[model samples]
Target: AAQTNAPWGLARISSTSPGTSTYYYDESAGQGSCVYVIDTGIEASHPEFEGRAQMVKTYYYSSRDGNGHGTHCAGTVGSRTYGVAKKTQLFGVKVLDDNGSGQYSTIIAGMDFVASDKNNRNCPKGVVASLSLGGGYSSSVNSAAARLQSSGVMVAVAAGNNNADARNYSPASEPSVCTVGASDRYDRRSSFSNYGSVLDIFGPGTDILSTWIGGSTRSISGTSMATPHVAGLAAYLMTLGKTTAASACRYIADTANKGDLSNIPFGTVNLLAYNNYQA
Candidate 1:
């Protein structure tokens, strides 16, 4: 029988591994793409990652995931089971500490590192920056995201979990980045998901199961979980020659499931994300 309890976030988007019986999107399993998770860090030895995850850069801590948030988000981006692009190289850039707190300067520095290709330390095929953290709007963060986009790095960020206007958030409000909001299994907006015109897309975020620290799995909810789904999609598109960040954004917006949302503003309705790459 088919796996009944498989990660529905991936199933909802139709993201399946190659050679699987249900495989559909074949442009690339993010083979030549790299996704950078800027958060508390990642468990580099997590089994779900199949050893593809690495701590490429560190801003505060030693790139060890003690908070578990970064690892969980990383899994959704490229884990063997929970990921959207299963083969994408996963890199961890530690910006937040174990306490889940970080400074905007440190976060900006992390973005700078990812956007820079100094000494070949960055991904050469393509890069996608996945951020699951947010705060009030910051011009510095917005500028960093814009710079990354200009340098050919696609950015995916959370729309915050405050249930307020996402426009009040920093990276989410940043016009250049792909800001993701949360959606439930019923295709409705999540209760705590921040919404507004600033939100660029919606993804499965509620009760989402993904890889966690210590080689385990758990279910979590938030716009944080939703951001990586879009990051994975960006990686998959990158492998298929959608190298330009803006182009990838356009592809996602043009092909997303637009009519599935309710109680969301009309301006942001077109941002609902779907995983049908064959379209």
Candidate 2:
């Protein structure tokens, strides 16, 4: 059944058509999954989390989100209201700063930590993490991100906002990462989203309203925002027993809606992230 008056992004992903305003999801899809948002921290105390989210690590500052990017992305990933996965456990790892950017070394360290924590955390349902931050290609960053994926944690990354080839970015271009691009409600690529063969799929990003800092909500846009949608779905898929990153990524890429978005770039696939939460 479809949930009426759902979020636009949720509704868009659930249906093949861009005109629909309802969302369809399996109520129990995210029960055992776990998700991590590695970004500019998160306001885990915000009501959107319903106490399901917590900040587990910080590179240089407080566990609280001074920047809204992380919280908004976190919301899209697992907020009880705006997220794709309702029951998946959510954790925040603050690698980026309040300015919404970070050094490659710090980012790599963040990945390395998650790769290790997956074991210590006893993630019974498997895990997925969203890296909504990227920079110029760096072998170290790519290596770290790949290792995280190889550790059985599904890694979802942003395709960058350069409006150019995604291959120019780090984790986004890494072969082992599930790179995501951005699309709008009109079924078109967001004008600022990077695209290329490196991109695995697209998700709603334009004017996306989600949890923000200051214990409020705001609408924003970026490939950063889109990546979490994929991460959330990937985590939810893990609950269905696709515990490995490879299987989860394969399931997501396979179940994605096709030929739905307009203005797909020349080398990129015309696929938009989609999930019906099959039981």
- Candidate 1: list runs displaced more than 4 Å: 1-5, 15-24, 117-124
TM-score of 1: 0.91
Which stretches of candidate 2 lie above 4 Å from their native place?
277-279
Q: Whose TM-score is greatest here?
A: 2
CA-lDDT, candidates in order: 0.81, 0.86
> Which candidate comes out best when scored by lDDT?
2
lDDT of 2 by residue, 1-279 (tens): 456786799888787778787777877658777888999998989998999888989998487789899999999998987888878888889999898879999999999999888776756777898999999998889999999998889999999999999998998999888999999999999999999999999999898878999889989999998999899888777776654666776677888898878888777988898885442
Rate residue 80 of model 1 by lDDT. Answer: 79
Determine which window of 10 residues in candidate 1 has minimal summed lDDT.
15-24
